[PDB]
């Protein structure tokens, strides 16, 4: 078969998209400028790095007054604020002060650890119940509530690109921005697309059919000393970086934007709890967890058979 590769940047990282040509459909040129032109709508709607994104500009309202967004932005939003309940509590896209203190936003930080005051004050305007929606449009009970889509806009924007593909005739693709993927059909060799797990390097490569893959954290954290955990993920029970023994979180789903919100999620959970939650509502999740001994995975009943 013929396989076209289209790459190019997004997000503050890259897309990789991979096709098989076929009879009829649109030249590689104009489904690139198309594929640019939505993932710049992506960014539009939903950076927190522009000041004048849809998100920013609701960040920046100061009013408990309706804010009119897209359907997509409100769609996204939607789909946090489900997770959030999926994830009791541990998914939280209203924890964007706690990530830019913590130095994992657009907000310039120091080295110089922030203090206990410091800490309870970013704490205190967080929290998923200050935020409502009402057709396409957000609400903010409280001035200063920042919204962090960057756990579900990666996989939304996935999304788009594949319901793109899908619109113009392509039914054999791989869509990756960032490490989050779709997929559908068949490769280059007529065998389903394939996906390396990564395991402390030791590499297992699976076939999830037609799905959406997401994964949070990677094999190397295994490799650093004790002390406290480096990490852009916060639990927002203390307000810090997450400091479990979960190494990666890898999660199946129809949905990239589903898939990328749920690992982050069930990774701030943790083993015990999160294995429970993806038993209770049949989700394909292998964790990677840290043991004395080494490393653990724990599959779901529904992740199995794709080893
Ligand atoms: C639309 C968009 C535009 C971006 N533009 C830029 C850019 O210009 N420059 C740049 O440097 N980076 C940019 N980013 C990246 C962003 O700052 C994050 O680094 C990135 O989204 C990391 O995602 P991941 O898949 O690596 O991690 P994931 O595990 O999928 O998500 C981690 C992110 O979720 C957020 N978060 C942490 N804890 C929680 C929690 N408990 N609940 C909910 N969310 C939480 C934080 O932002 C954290 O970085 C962009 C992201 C998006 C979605
Ligand atoms: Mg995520
Ligand atoms: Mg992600």
Same mark, same amino acid.
């Given at each position: 078969?013929?396989?076209?590769?289209?790459?190019?940047?997004?997000?503050?990282?890259?897309?990789?998209?991979?096709? +098989?040509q076929?009879?009829?459909?649109?030249d590689?040129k104009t489904?690139?400028?198309?594929?640019?032109?939505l993932?710049?709508?992506?960014?539009?709607?939903?950076?927190?790095?522009?000041?004048?994104?849809?998100?920013?500009?609701?960040?920046?309202?100061?009013?408990?007054?309706?804010?009119?967004?897209?359907?997509?932005?409100?769609?996204?939003?939607?789909?946090?604020?489900?997770?959030?309940?999926?994830?009791?509590?541990?998914?939280?896209?209203?924890?964007?002060?706690?990530?830019?203190?913590?130095?994992?936003?657009?907000?310039?930080?120091?080295?110089?650890?922030?203090?206990?005051?410091?800490?309870?004050?970013?704490?205190?305007?967080?929290?998923?119940?200050?935020?409502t929606?009402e057709?396409?449009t957000?609400?903010?009970? +409280?001035?200063?509530?920042?919204?962090?889509?960057?756990?579900?806009?990666?996989?939304?924007?996935?999304?788009?690109?594949?319901?793109?593909?899908?619109?113009?005739?392509?039914?054999?693709?791989?869509?990756?921005?960032?490490?989050?993927?779709?997929?559908?059909?068949?490769?280059?060799?007529?065998?389903?697309?394939?996906?390396?797990?990564?395991?402390?390097?030791?590499?297992?490569?699976?076939?999830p059919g037609?799905?959406?893959?997401?994964?949070?954290?990677?094999?190397?954290?295994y490799?650093?000393?004790?002390g406290?955990?480096?990490?852009? +993920?916060?639990?927002?029970?203390?307000?810090?970086?997450?400091n479990?023994?979960?190494?990666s979180?890898?999660?199946?789903?129809?949905?990239?934007?589903?898939a990328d919100?749920?690992?982050?999620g069930?990774?701030?959970?943790?083993?015990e709890?999160?294995?429970?939650?993806?038993?209770?509502?049949?989700?394909?999740?292998?964790?990677?967890?840290?043991?004395?001994?080494?490393?653990?995975?724990?599959?779901?009943?529904?992740?199995?058979?794709?080893?």
């Open positions: 078969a013929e396989q076209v590769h289209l790459s190019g940047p997004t997000m503050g990282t890259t897309y990789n998209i991979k096709y +098989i076929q009879p009829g459909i649109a590689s489904l690139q400028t198309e594929i640019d032109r993932l710049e709508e992506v960014n539009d709607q939903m950076s927190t790095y522009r000041k004048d994104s849809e998100l920013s500009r609701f960040n920046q309202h100061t009013s408990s007054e309706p804010f009119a967004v897209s359907t997509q932005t409100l769609t996204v939003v939607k789909e946090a604020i489900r997770l959030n309940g999926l994830t009791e509590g541990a998914l939280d896209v209203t924890v964007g002060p706690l990530v830019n203190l913590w130095g994992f936003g657009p907000e310039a930080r120091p080295d110089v650890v922030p203090t206990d005051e410091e800490l309870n004050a970013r704490r205190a305007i967080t929290g998923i119940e200050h935020l929606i057709g396409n957000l609400s903010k009970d +409280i001035p200063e509530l920042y919204v962090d889509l960057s756990t579900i806009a990666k996989g939304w924007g996935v999304d788009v690109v594949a319901d793109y593909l899908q619109s113009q005739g392509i039914e054999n693709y791989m869509v990756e921005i960032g490490g989050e993927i779709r997929l559908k059909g068949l490769n280059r060799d007529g065998v389903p697309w394939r996906i390396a797990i990564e395991k402390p390097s030791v590499q297992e490569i699976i076939e037609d799905y959406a893959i997401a994964t949070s954290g990677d094999y190397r954290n490799f650093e000393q004790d406290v955990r480096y990490s852009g +993920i916060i639990d927002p029970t203390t307000g810090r970086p997450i479990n023994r979960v190494v979180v890898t999660v199946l789903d129809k949905s990239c934007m589903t919100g749920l690992a982050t069930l990774m701030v959970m943790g083993e709890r999160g294995m429970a939650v993806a038993e209770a509502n049949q989700i394909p999740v292998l964790m990677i967890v840290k043991t004395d001994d080494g490393f653990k995975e724990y599959a779901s009943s529904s992740f199995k058979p794709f080893l």
